[PDB]
Amino acid sequence: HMASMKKKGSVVIVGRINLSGDTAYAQQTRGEEGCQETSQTGRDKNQVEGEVQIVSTATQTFLATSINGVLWTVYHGAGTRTIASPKGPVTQMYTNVDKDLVGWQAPQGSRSLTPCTCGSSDLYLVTRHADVIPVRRRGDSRGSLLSPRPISYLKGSSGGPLLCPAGHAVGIFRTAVSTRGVAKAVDFIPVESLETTMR
Ligand SMILES: CCC[C@H](NC(=O)[C@@H]1[C@H]2CCC[C@H]2CN1C(=O)[C@@H](NC(=O)[C@@H](NC(=O)c1cnccn1)C1CCCCC1)C(C)(C)C)[C@@H](O)C(=O)NC1CC1
Numbered sequence: 001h002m003a004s005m006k007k008k009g010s011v012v013i014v015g016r017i018n019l020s021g022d023t024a025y026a027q028q029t030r031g032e033e034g035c036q037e038t039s040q041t042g043r044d045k046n047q048v049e050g051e052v053q054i055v056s057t058a059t060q061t062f063l064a065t066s067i068n069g070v071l072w073t074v075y076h077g078a079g080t081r082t083i084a085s086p087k088g089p090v091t092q093m094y095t096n097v098d099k100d101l102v103g104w105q106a107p108q109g110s111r112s113l114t115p116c117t118c119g120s121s122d123l124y125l126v127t128r129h130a131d132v133i134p135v136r137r138r139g140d141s142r143g144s145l146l147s148p149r150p151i152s153y154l155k156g157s158s159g160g161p162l163l164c165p166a167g168h169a170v171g172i173f174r175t176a177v178s179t180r181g182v183a184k185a186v187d188f189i190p191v192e193s194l195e196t197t198m199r
């Protein structure tokens with residue numbers, strides 16, 4: 001009974017959204033069997049690159065975004081889980097259920113986005129399928145899609161970035177705002193909220 005007590009696995013990086021060139025595209029770096037093993041050991045020796053990682057638990061796949069040397073994602077996806085790394089599991093450096101926000105030290109090899117300082121309300125959401133979707137900022141933590149999509153389109157994009165025209169991080173996508181299955185808007189965690197969390 002106490003001896004049969006299992007532990008939750010680590011979050012595992014299973015790919016990335018490549019934003020380095022003219023074309024955004026998703027790359028897978030680990031398959032399902034490797035993911036399952038790595039989640040249990042917490043030992044991930046794969047090379048990490050890029051700003052936006054595709055991450056998985058046993059039950060969910062979603063995104064994580066590096067900003068100012070922290071890999072950030074949503075609490076509703078990651079919970080309090082460690083992330084797998086070459087040295088074994090790494091404990092969260094930030095955990096905030098009230099903001100729906102968690103973060104780990106950014107993996108060696110990752111690149112970070114810089115927080116936006118320009119005040120622009122013309123944003124771009126990067127999805128787990130590497131779509132770059134225009135979003136008009138409508139408040140501190142909400143934006144509207146210029147073209148509404150079924151919510152399926154956004155499933156698994158939580159933890160991904162909203163970017164300004166200059167490619168700086170404005171926020172982390174948290175949840176879709178939907179009506180009868182159509183997403184018309186998105187809620188996000190503003191980068192200023194991350195910056196406060198960091199000090
Ligand atoms: C929504 C797309 C991204 C996913 N976000 C989520 O799953 C978040 C989580 C936040 C905590 C509760 C969950 C519900 N959720 C939602 O976005 C859900 N949105 C909602 O439930 C939104 N509510 C509504 O759309 C609504 C409200 N009244 C009546 C009818 N519909 C609320 C509205 C208030 C602000 C917050 C959003 C949705 C779209 C799935 C039904 C993300 O978790 C993800 O990447 N998923 C993949 C693994 C399956």
Ligand SMILES: [Zn+2]
Pocket residue numbers: 115116117118119120164165166167168
């Ligand atoms: Zn900016």
